[PDB]
Design a protein around this ligand. Structure first.
Ligand SMILES: COc1ccc(C[C@@H](C)NC[C@H](O)c2ccc(O)c(NC=O)c2)cc1
Length: 375
């Protein structure tokens, strides 16, 4: 029947269109607009470039191998399509793990990360990633280093109208390890460490502010100057500790600078012996802390939003690529337990992650405001 053709042609066309549109949207406004040229954006644009080339190359030409019968482009073009597929997949996963490592270095030891790498270092990392993926993909294919030991694969290597993908045990295992498993382990450990540090930051911040509120409350009904002085000393210590623990961080530190200044004025007034003026400055401190939790409601919201992030990134990447890289190994060993159509389906579930990546890595306020003017 014609159901197999028309039912699944439209979804493939829509997938290609979504992939190309998202990738050209992400690539644009990174190099054009200011405030969007950062070291992390250098990895993001490489990921977008890999997704774009994969969406133009292997999705349309690969779908051509589907629906209709066989290959009508050429054996050299078959090798080129296979090589570019492996290159794009490997480059995308390596770029994902590089972005993970970038976030880890940003969160862990932020002072060193403030200036340790520049555009030159990020570009060097990008070229290293891309050349590693190319060595993994192009080199073992176009001169037939994967080969096979099957009688229904020899009738395809020396026959034009066929583009199956039969590889040796060593090549399949090495490609799975380089492309997916090493990045999987690296990014799992990286994002687990990033999760813990973020939890601990929000935790210390919320503690500090509890003792700030308690000290302010005890000042509100304090009797003598000694109680006000002691409570203001504890408030100053906790405020400095919270200050010690992006323009958002700049505003955060500026607000804590204002709070520390007001606390210092209150403490000096209390030290001089004027309890009433100390209580008035404490009322001003109450105004400041009330002004705080409008901003922290927003920022605690953004933080639990990127904590869901860990979930969204990990779940999407794993659910998209892990089934394919498990079936790939369990297919080269005990080959008769694996069916071809489910192999193609699991590979296309990996393919469709190309259109998902822009919708996972562009959910920032700067990217959101930049995307509007292009539309
Ligand atoms: C019906 O037979 C076929 C024919 C072609 C394919 C697409 C394949 C070239 N894409 C391979 C996939 O895209 C990929 C990506 C990254 C990798 O590291 C490896 N490794 C394989 O050993 C494989 C699939 C099944």
């Amino acid at each position: 029947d014609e159901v197999w053709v028309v039912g699944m042609g439209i979804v493939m066309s829509l997938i290609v269109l979504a992939i190309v549109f998202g990738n050209v949207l992400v690539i644009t406004a990174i190099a054009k607009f200011e405030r969007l040229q950062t070291v992390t954006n250098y990895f993001i644009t490489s990921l977008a470039c890999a997704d774009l080339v994969m969406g133009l190359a292997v999705v349309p030409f690969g779908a051509a191998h589907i629906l209709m019968k066989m290959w009508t482009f050429g054996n050299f073009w078959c090798e080129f399509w296979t090589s570019i597929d492996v290159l794009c997949v490997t480059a995308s996963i390596e770029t994902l793990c590089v972005i993970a490592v970038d976030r880890y270095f940003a969160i862990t030891s932020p002072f060193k990360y403030q200036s340790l790498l520049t555009k030159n270092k990020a570009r060097v990392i990008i070229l290293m990633v891309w050349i590693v993926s190319g060595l993994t993909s192009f080199l073992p294919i176009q001169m037939h280093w994967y080969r096979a030991t099957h009688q229904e694969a020899i009738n395809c290597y020396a026959e034009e109208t066929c583009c199956d993908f039969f590889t040796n045990q060593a090549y399949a295992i090495a490609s799975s390890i380089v492309s997916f498993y090493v990045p999987l382990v690296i990014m799992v450990f990286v994002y687990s460490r990033v999760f813990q540090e973020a939890k601990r930051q929000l935790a210390d911040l919320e503690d500090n502010w509890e003792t700030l509120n308690d000290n302010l409350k005890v000042i509100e009904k304090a009797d003598n100057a000694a109680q006000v002085k002691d409570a203001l000393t504890k408030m100053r210590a906790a405020a400095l500790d919270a200050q010690k623990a992006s323009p958002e961080m700049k505003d955060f530190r500026h607000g804590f600078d204002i709070l520390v200044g007001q606390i210092d004025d209150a403490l000096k007034l209390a030290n001089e012996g004027k309890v009433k003026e100390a209580q008035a400055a404490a009322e001003q401190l109450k105004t400041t802390r009330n002004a705080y939790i409008q901003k922290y409601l927003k920022f605690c919201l953004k933080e639990h939003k990127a904590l869901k992030t860990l979930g969204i990134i990990m779940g999407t990447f794993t659910l998209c690529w892990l089934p394919f890289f498990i079936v790939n190994i369990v297919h080269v060993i005990q080959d008769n337990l694996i069916r071809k159509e489910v192999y193609i389906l699991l590979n296309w579930i990996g393919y469709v992650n190309s259109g998902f990546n822009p919708l996972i890595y562009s959910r920032s306020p700067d990217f959101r405001i930049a995307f509007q003017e292009l539309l």
